[PDB]
Design a binder for this molecule. Structure first.
Ligand SMILES: Nc1nc2c(ncn2[C@@H]2O[C@H](COP(=O)(O)OP(=O)(O)NP(=O)(O)O)[C@@H](O)[C@H]2O)c(=O)[nH]1
Lengths: 349, 166
């Protein structure tokens, strides 16, 4: 259970004592800090828990997806001490003129930098980072950050590696709350997604709404390679939206049959029900997605499940006018089911 | 410039958090949020001098009674807060005063006696009894209401004045 932690917020000139749960993700502790600060900070999602530089150690941001227990507390203080800091560029073992740093980060120069990223001018980007540019910023018009923009370009691996070596945070979110991993996934940029994961970016990053990149892929459809890449890198399944739709519910509503098959192969819970009690098969019946319903039945979905309206998938299909789909459900027999031959293998990193 | 460490010391639900919010954020906290330990810093001008205030809002519950020793050592002055409606808080002030003296190990520590919830109609603590207690202690007594911001600036500024004396 939870422990008393002192969190310092230097931007607010405040300290707060929170109970934080070490057996829960850092993300969860961050949420608790944000709540108790009733006065919302600007671009709050970018603020992160921070381990202050101690003796013979450097300052580091806590990993959002890692459990809080992974960061054992400094014993220097009577209570454990963390800070809540904006995810600014870290110039570890770097000292530069305040005005020179100010000159580097002018609106014009940040726009120039974003132009270099867009033009794929890797060497010019690297030289500016070498001189101390902080890549953790937003373009005013686009709302993109350098890393999120690079993640949408072809052959982005060079830019992504250079930006990360130059201090770009992998979880820096855009004005809309999306990380670089979200952006690569949405654009179906498999090369950029693979490099982000190779660089240590988590596959479970949450957006403003709490939806992960994998969830976005299921909503988006199209080339299913990115979906598979996330799942292969141990992306977590079973994320829900406000109405309790999981990834398979979304894939089924829109007929994204390739996304569905990947999700099912990697262990998605077929019996998960949303707020209405509808399973993925109910969703197929509601939206007349016969291609998806066949996959669900074939892989062993339970067709007997009733929603909270006491309706089976079959009954939902009939009520919706999907008579051909309903006959596929009715006609199906248990002997038809073929369980997956092989269990998934996952990426080493 | 000077830095003054002010510690708000008081029983649970006495208005310590509400007083601190009024001085710093100029706003009244309606709902009941229990405190463990909260710190605020503010730049103010008192008697023609600009001074940084270090304000420590402490926990009224005995659950976090462990932290009491550390904050009493660091803080230069204390605001002992009791609710005018609640008699228990008034009686608890003696314990806090003794602990401050014991940890500080000095007869003279800057202290200010605050009676909160002045606005509440049903007052179970007379002004005179509080004034008598203040006189025995040799420190000022202020009646402060966080809801109307009445005397809030006076109580904190008075304590800064007490700190200046020693
Ligand atoms: N009318 C009135 N109500 C107050 C005043 N101060 C607090 N309250 C109300 O009564 C409750 C007690 O205030 P609060 O600041 O939580 O007490 P505290 O001094 O922080 N004690 P602790 O933090 O240890 O729980 C609050 O929920 C608030 O709504 C006050 O000066 N006047």
């Amino acid at each position: 259970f939870a422990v008393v932690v002192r969190v310092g917020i230097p931007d607010l000139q405040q300290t707060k004592c929170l109970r934080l749960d070490p057996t829960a993700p850092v993300w969860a502790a961050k949420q608790r800090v944000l709540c108790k600060l009733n006065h919302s900070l600007q671009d709050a999602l970018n603020y992160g828990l921070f381990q202050p530089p101690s003796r013979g150690r450097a300052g580091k941001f806590l990993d959002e997806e890692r459990l809080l227990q992974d960061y054992p507390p400094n014993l220097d203080t009577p209570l454990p001490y963390l800070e809540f800091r904006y995810k600014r560029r870290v110039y570890a073992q770097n000292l530069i003129d305040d005005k020179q740093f100010a000159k580097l980060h002018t609106k014009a120069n940040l726009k120039k930098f974003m132009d270099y990223v867009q033009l794929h001018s890797t060497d010019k980007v690297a030289r500016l980072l070498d001189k101390g540019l902080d890549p953790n910023f937003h373009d005013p018009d686009s709302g993109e950050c350098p890393l999120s923009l690079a993640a949408q370009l072809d052959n982005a691996t060079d830019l992504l590696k250079v930006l990360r070596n130059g201090g770009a945070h992998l979880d820096f979110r855009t004005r809309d709350g999306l990380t670089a991993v979200h952006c690569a996934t949405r654009q179906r940029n498999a090369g950029a997604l693979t490099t982000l994961l190779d660089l240590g970016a988590s596959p479970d990053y949450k957006d403003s709404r709490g939806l992960t990149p994998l969830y976005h892929s299921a909503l988006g459809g199209g080339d299913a390679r990115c979906c598979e890449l996330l799942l292969h890198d141990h992306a977590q399944l079973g994320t829900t939206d406000e109405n309790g739709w999981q990834e398979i519910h979304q894939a089924c509503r829109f007929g994204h049959v390739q996304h569905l098959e990947h999700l099912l192969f990697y262990g998605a819970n077929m019996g998960a029900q949303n707020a209405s009690g509808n399973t993925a098969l109910h969703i197929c019946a509601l939206y007349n997605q016969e291609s998806c319903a066949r996959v669900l039945l074939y892989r062993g979905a339970n067709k007997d499940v009733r929603n909270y309206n006491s309706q089976t998938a079959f009954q939902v299909a009939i009520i919706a006018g999907n008579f051909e789909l309903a006959e596929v459900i009715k006609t199906h027999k248990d002997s038809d089911v073929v369980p997956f031959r092989e269990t998934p293998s996952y990426a080493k990193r | 410039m000077t830095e003054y460490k002010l510690v708000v010391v008081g029983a649970g639900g006495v208005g310590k958090s509400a007083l601190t919010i009024q001085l710093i954020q100029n706003h009244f906290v309606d709902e009941y949020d229990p405190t463990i330990e909260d710190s605020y810093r503010k730049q103010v001008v008192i008697d023609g001098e600009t001074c940084l205030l270090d304000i420590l809002d402490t926990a009224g519950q005995e659950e976090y009674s462990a932290m009491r020793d550390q904050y009493m050592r660091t803080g230069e002055g204390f605001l002992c807060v009791f609710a005018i409606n609640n008699t228990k808080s008034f009686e608890d002030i003696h314990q806090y005063r003794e602990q401050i003296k014991r940890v500080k190990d000095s007869d003279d520590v800057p202290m200010v006696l605050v009676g909160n919830k002045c606005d509440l109609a049903a007052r179970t603590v007379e002004s005179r009894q509080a004034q008598d207690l203040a006189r025995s202690y040799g420190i000022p007594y202020i009646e402060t209401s966080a809801k109307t911001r009445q005397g809030v600036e006076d109580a904190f500024y008075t304590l800064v004045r007490e700190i200046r004396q020693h």
